[PDB]
């Protein structure tokens with residue numbers, strides 16, 4: 001792609017999400033989501049192969065259906081409120097339709113059926129854009145309509161996402177589908193604590209964006225998209241195996257790492273509201289995520305899968321890749337737990 | 348974990364680029380025939396048009 | 399009310415010129431007179447095969463330029479406002495954005511047909 | 514001489530070193546200036562002098 | 563003079579015609595040396611190629 | 618680094634330096650076709666940059682001090698042991714073939730890098746478009762297995778699709794008898810073990826598969842043995858070629874920008890040579906790979922990045 | 938019997954086989970847009986009729 005056009009398309013993706021974030025009118029919310037979708041479609045088709053066309057078709061149909069449900073929720077809000085302020089909705093039908101729309105846009109289960117498909121079909125950079133930057137605009141709108149979100153609906157979506165994203169990553173050897181089912185589970189974590197304390201939802205969003213950006217930057221730096229290709233990293237650059245070790249142990253929620261920070265705080269905000277069974281099921285379900293994380297750390301760091309002879313050529317060439325903010329994101333994704341009370345800046 | 352369903356699933360390619368499976372485009376065969384004001388009375392152009 | 403009467407009249411004596419076109423003459427129907435016309439010889443294949451569009455990018459961009467005359471069309475009315483320099487700047491912004499789109503569609507050879 | 518080619522990191526990019534040191538020294542003097550302004554404003558707003 | 567066109571369609575103008583003709587005529591003679599000396603094609607084509615090359 | 622999207626944006630277009638002297642030329646032929654001087658001679662009349670043929674130690678010549686690394690560090694293979702016993706049990710045949718394919722991929726990347734960065738054409742010897750014929754000879758003489766051919770086909774299928782063919786392919790007809798005569802006059806005691814059927818298989822995969830598939834995507838100049846001794850003949854034919862075939866016609870600034878951003882990243886070039894296909898000829902197990910990697914790190918000038926080594930005498934490292 | 942089979946059976950292996958079986962059931966989809974959006978329709982119909990999430 002022409003890099004001027006790449007800059008304009010990425011600035012238009014950012015412009016769509018910022019128009020969702022800053023606007024006080026529902027039509028401008030919908031315009032921002034349409035602009036975000038319309039600009040992110042060629043980022044998925046950067047390489048022009050049939051898997052990118054398939055992934056882009058599936059993504060376009062899911063996001064178009066979600067935008068239809070969003071605009072019907074907006075028109076029903078216009079009927080039952082006569083206005084357009086981005087705030088709570090004045091009808092549980094519009095509340096349900098906008099919650100379904102935002103659950104489809106996040107790819108939360110049982111609308112999860114596009115996230116591993118689309119994430120497998122596209123490159124790692126567009127997968128990073130999809131799994132981090134597109135998780136900001138619907139979470140903004142969910143943060144803005146929480147006086148009208150049905151409790152049972154968003155908790156059903158949350159724990160169904162946590163369970164299905166936990167089970168999905170266990171049957172995987174492709175790293176992009178692993179990160180996609182990890183995304184399903186973690187969006188379930190974020191939306192579970194939405195009606196209890198949305199500051200913890202923002203904290204989980206930021207820590208998950210840091211850890212996901214760390215893992216995709218490590219994957220792009222290693223030029224690996226499968227488990228068995230990532231397993232040759234010890235023979236090429238052994239520090240990257242240490243970084244994926246500490247980052248996948250962070251994403252599993254093990255202390256003393258910062259990925260234990262959101263989850264624990266979510267439990268800290270759900271036992272206050274006298275819900276003990278639900279974060280217990282959430283925590284026990286997170287062991288599935290930790291299991292396929294430990295599978296990747298066994299295949300990469302803690303053992304040594306056999307390499308080839310041609311690896312001896314790649315010993316002679318260092319990495320000329322723009323590993324943008326990789327040590328900063330690695331330190332933020334692993335050693336941030338003693339700074340856990342920083343979350344009050346997100347209030 | 349291979350099952351009965353997950354047994355025909357070959358692993359995906361390395362550069363994520365699939366061979367094009369070159370199904371025939373089937374060019375539309377016009378019969379620019381003899382009864383025509385342009386073909387001068389007696390001329391049967393069997394042409395193949397891509398549109 | 400008058401529009402429905404006028405449309406019903408036009409549709410009626412457009413479909414009463416067809417029902418006296420099919421029922422008035424004498425028919426001699428046989429299964430070679432109703433064969434497909436292909437200049438005398440029998441047609442090779444169907445005419446329901448894909449007829450590949452060469453002008454497809456212009457066909458898509460027509461859908462993005464036809465919205466402009468749903469946007470540029472209130473300009474006889476928008477000139478009647480009391481904030482007029484703002485209106486003029488936004489109008490010339492819309493025609494300029496259409497023009498920049500058309501310039502970009504030229505320069506990447508998008509208005510040319512394929513093959 | 515060892516290398517058969519000229520490596521890209523053979524010589525220090527003195528523009529980049531100068532920008533790095535200037536940016537870092539500016540951030541330190543602005544941090545210390547902001548902290549002194551903050552302790553002055555705190556001792557002023559509460560009479561803790 | 564740098565002749566602009568040849569007048570023929572598809573016949574592109576040669577920038578250096580003299581050296582190109584010397585190339586092609588010595589190349590014809592080099593290929594044509596592989597023919598027996600009693601063959602009339604060799605004698606006649608060497609004759610006309612040397613005539614054109616001397617011109 | 619040095620080249621990126623910002624250089625393309627701020628003015629460095631790769632077709633502003635693309636002259637009519639910018640021609641990528643590959644001189645091919647059998648084992649003793651005499652092309653070795655010919656390419657240099659074609660490089661010295663057209664003013665082009667000659668690259669020698671990629672042996673095992675081309676990557677050793679391009680990095681470090683340029684001196685050849687020991688064979689356990691680069692290659693783990695030997696051409697001479699392939700000439701001794703081509704049907705060996707350690708799988709030296711396909712291991713040599715795969716290392717030579719990776720070295721020629723690196724060489725072709727270097728050729729395109731010089732061609733697109735400087736605008737000067739590069740004369741090569743047996744690029745990646747012609748390497749495969751040796752594999753096929755190795756497959757016809759029973760030296761390798763079909764799984765080795767499948768591994769080579771997967772690596773070639775994902776690597777050669779990203780690069781362009783040359784402009785000119787020069788092929789030198791030397792028959793099997795004269796190749797054997799030049800081998801006996803060469804004096805290499807391992808090279809005189811090359812069989813007649815292996816040379817005939819090299820000539821057959823040349824004349825049956827390589828040249829019918831390159832004659833549409835580039836221009837072939839098939840010379841014989843006697844007429845290729847004159848460099849003026851070959852360059853005299855090159856300078857009057859009507860360049861019309863191939864995908865070099867439809868390359869703008871953007872496509873060759875993408876090609877150049879691919880080419881200068883050498884690990885992205887060498888990404889798919891080590892695909893995880895566990896083949897017994899090329900798979901080095903865990904402890905041997907760890908031992909040879911930790912021995913490679915302790916080599917002089919190899920322990921760090923190429924400007925960060927005090928043992929060979931790099932200065933100002935605390936400011937780099 | 939106990940500490941290689943039955944106490945090995947009841948806690949870890951039942952849970953391991955259950956998570957293996959559920960992981961194989963979830964991920965065994967065919968990648969079809971038709972079946973995914975038909976499941977979306979069934980989700981909307983359960984949310985409206987069966988579960989009263991529009992209330």
Ligand SMILES: CCCCCCCCCCCCCCCCCC(=O)OC[C@H](COP(=O)([O-])OCC[N+](C)(C)C)OC(=O)CCCCCCCCCCCCCCCCC
Nearest residue numbers: 271272273274275276277278280281284285287948949952
């Ligand atoms: C090592 C393997 C086995 C592990 C066993 C672990 C312990 C077994 C029991 C765990 C129960 C769940 C946590 C209980 C926390 C109690 C906190 C509390 O104050 O509770 C009072 C609260 C009471 O609610 P309340 O406090 O909001 O009520 C208000 C106060 N009154 C009572 C006056 C109205 O209890 C609960 O909410 C429910 C407690 C039972 C939860 C049942 C679900 C979990 C079932 C067992 C799971 C066991 C592990 C599963 C994994 C196995 C391996 C994969």
Ligand SMILES: CCCCCCCCCCCCCCCCCC(=O)OC[C@H](COP(=O)(O)OCCN)OC(=O)CCCCCCCCCCCCCCCCC
Nearest residue numbers: 125128129132133202205206209210213217220322324325
């Ligand atoms: C509650 C709401 C809070 C909102 C906070 C907003 C904060 C900023 C936005 C965060 C969201 C994620 C941002 C990153 C999205 C992906 C960007 C991307 O893909 O950039 C492209 C680029 C590609 O690099 P390259 O290797 O050249 O790729 C080859 C080309 N195929 O590069 C990459 O792919 C590499 C990654 C580049 C960016 C990484 C750093 C940003 C994200 C990590 C957090 C950093 C800490 C500071 C911010 C904290 C909050 C997130």
Ligand SMILES: CCCCCCCCCCCCCCCCCC(=O)OC[C@H](COP(=O)(O)OCCN)OC(=O)CCCCCCCCCCCCCCCCC
Nearest residue numbers: 493494495496497498499500501502503504505506507510
């Ligand atoms: C600032 C004023 C307002 C400007 C914005 C509003 C514009 C209104 C009109 C809408 C135009 C939309 C489409 C424009 C497309 C322009 C790009 C273009 O077509 O460039 C190609 C063309 C040469 O065509 P070619 O590439 O050979 O095409 C082959 C097939 N015919 O290239 C050319 O022919 C060269 C075009 C550029 C030079 C034109 C110079 C005209 C100067 C007039 C006087 C000054 C006017 C003020 C503007 C500054 C002009 C420099």
Ligand SMILES: Nc1ncnc2c1ncn2[C@@H]1O[C@H](COP(=O)(O)O)[C@@H](O)[C@H]1O
Nearest residue numbers: 648649650651653670714717748751752
């Ligand atoms: N892929 C290959 N497999 C085996 N031998 C090769 C391969 N490529 C080049 N060679 C050898 O390289 C030498 C080239 O000949 P020359 O460089 O003219 O001495 C011959 O010994 C060839 O057999």
